[PDB]
Structure 1
């Protein structure tokens, strides 16, 4: 008959109960100004469909973040802009300040509030058990907020989290893969970055929701507390599920695929194997024990679950004893 339908346990109908204008990005009218008002300072990053810069607004001598969009599908550009406008100002969300276009290139660019990012490959120097809890809570504020606004990020990873450690300022960025959640909609599973893909994407289960972001979050937490980047190190999309199965076990994987009546790809036949469920304590060592606690492990166990419905929602995660200290 096919896979069993599923829907989010929270914010299920938030979009259904709103007007067409809020979620119909294909019909949204994008109006941009002249890029002549901005001068590029330095490169911050580079993506598949973008290049991020530090820039100066010449009319007020204020630093900004400028994201130059590589002309991809116009609906994709429209989706991101609509999403950014809907979320503009939300807690720990990158704030869109302006939309422009260079007169000569006709290339569209997005202008954001300035964030002074501290180096990722040089942040763990003074990043304590408290720091991790504090920044994890800041990400959860962003997540409950965008989820409450009927949006799933679908690309949660360290590269999409900007941290200004001196001011304890965090921003969830790159809303280019984000999408409006509509219950029963079937989404393209070719989202998120390989190491952060939820089991739903890997088993080609299209009816996923907000909980996909909570699996990605769990991946980030595990790499941070265990000092193992990435935590699930797949070499391809099929191998990624094997790496998760080596930790969560194959019994609970079949239990999940049986629950939703998912049919596994033949590519999994020769590689999946048989694996027992491991204890989270197995990943503790001298180099990471100062960041691990029974609270951290309990919180992690409730995020990294095959069953997307069994994972904590962002609002439930904020109530976990791991955050009592913050």
Structure 2
């Protein structure tokens, strides 16, 4: 009975993902996030090993929630008559990257390097677990303000990772690649790299580079803030129009702009405290 196991707090947010509340596990006072999703609104369904009908999100979270890392872990879940309820890790104090950027404006490159690196490690972890996130962006990353650690959230638009083409997409359009816009097709890793380019631009410029379909399709990157040449180069590389022209994760992390990253804790002490 989830009713008695958790003390429900205030609404943290709601939108396309459903409704997410602050909570506390009664047994040990562990801070949690309680996410409700209506079944009528669940588009993609999946199956547990033990053969049970469940939201793909839950399948993806399980595959990815084993071990430590930069992904928010699924602690438990429940099925209700017309909804599923997910119990998720909740860091505290925390702020999502979108609000963080809005507040501080464009980030110092040293900070953006540390954040971006951690996002890369998290996404690599998902891919190693057979999971494609598909909605990488500032709103889907949490910053643990005390530890300097980022955490990927919201796998509700995700899919099992495969090497064949995807012909469906339900992530954020302004983060979707030109091949989706033009052809309604993309491959997982290379689409992910494109969204990482948007994300990195967003961090160092304090806003998204493209707003309309035609800008995405043109792929011309204009910098509105001062950004080093190395960083501009990495961004333009991630945002190559031809998917095959984009860097692999390894090539991103071996890029000269990516060298000498701060540890998360160093990052918090310098930039967060």
**TM-score w.r.t. length of structure 2:** 0.82
1:305 maps to 240
1:30 maps to none
Alignment of 1:47-62 (within 5 A): 47-62=15-30
Structure-2 change in CA distance of 1:245 and 1:183 (3 Å) = closer
1:85 maps to 62
DSSP 3-state at the match of 1:162: strand
Q: Answer yes or no: is the 8 Å Cα contact 1:162–1:170 preserved in 2.
A: yes
1:231 is the counterpart of 2:196: no
Larger radius of gyration: 1
More relative contact order, 1 or 2 (CA 8 Å, 6+ apart): 1
1:156 is the counterpart of 2:126: no
Please identify which structure carries the higher strand content: 2
Greater Cα offset, 132-141 or 159-168: 159-168
Cα distance between partner residues in 2 of 1:169 and 1:128: 17
1:75 is the counterpart of 2:45: yes
Alignment of 1:116-195 (within 5 A): 116=92, 117-118=94-95, 120-123=98-101, 124-125=103-104, 127-184=107-164, 186-195=165-174
Cα distance between partner residues in 1 of 2:82 and 2:55: 16
2:75 maps to 97
1:29 maps to none
Cα distance between partner residues in 2 of 1:83 and 1:121: 26
Cα distance between partner residues in 1 of 2:166 and 2:104: 40
Cα distance between partner residues in 1 of 2:166 and 2:143: 30
Cα distance between partner residues in 2 of 1:196 and 1:223: 11
Cα distance between partner residues in 2 of 1:191 and 1:90: 28
Cα distance between partner residues in 1 of 2:245 and 2:128: 19
Consecutive unaligned residues of structure 2, counting only runs of 5 or more, are 47-53, 262-273
Where has structure 1 moved over 6 Å in runs of 4 or more?
Answer: none
Structure-2 change in CA distance of 1:325 and 1:207 (3 Å) = closer
DSSP 3-state at the match of 2:202: helix
DSSP 3-state at the match of 1:283: coil
DSSP 3-state at the match of 2:193: helix
Deviation at 1:191, TM superposition (A): 2.5
DSSP 3-state at the match of 2:188: coil
Computed over aligned residues only, the root mean square deviation of the Cα atoms, in angstroms, reads: 2.2
Cα distance between partner residues in 2 of 1:137 and 1:99: 30
2:200 maps to 221
Cα distance between partner residues in 2 of 1:122 and 1:215: 22
2:267 maps to none
1:36 maps to 4
Q: Answer yes or no: is the 8 Å Cα contact 2:8–2:24 preserved in 1.
A: yes
Structure-2 change in CA distance of 1:203 and 1:245 (3 Å) = closer
Deviation at 1:45, TM superposition (A): 1.7
Structure-2 change in CA distance of 1:183 and 1:68 (3 Å) = same
Consecutive unaligned residues of structure 1, counting only runs of 5 or more, are 1-32, 235-239, 249-279
DSSP 3-state at the match of 2:12: strand
Deviation at 1:74, TM superposition (A): 6.8
Deviation at 1:101, TM superposition (A): 4.1
DSSP 3-state at the match of 1:118: strand
Q: Answer yes or no: is the 8 Å Cα contact 1:191–1:197 preserved in 2.
A: no
1:209 is the counterpart of 2:188: yes
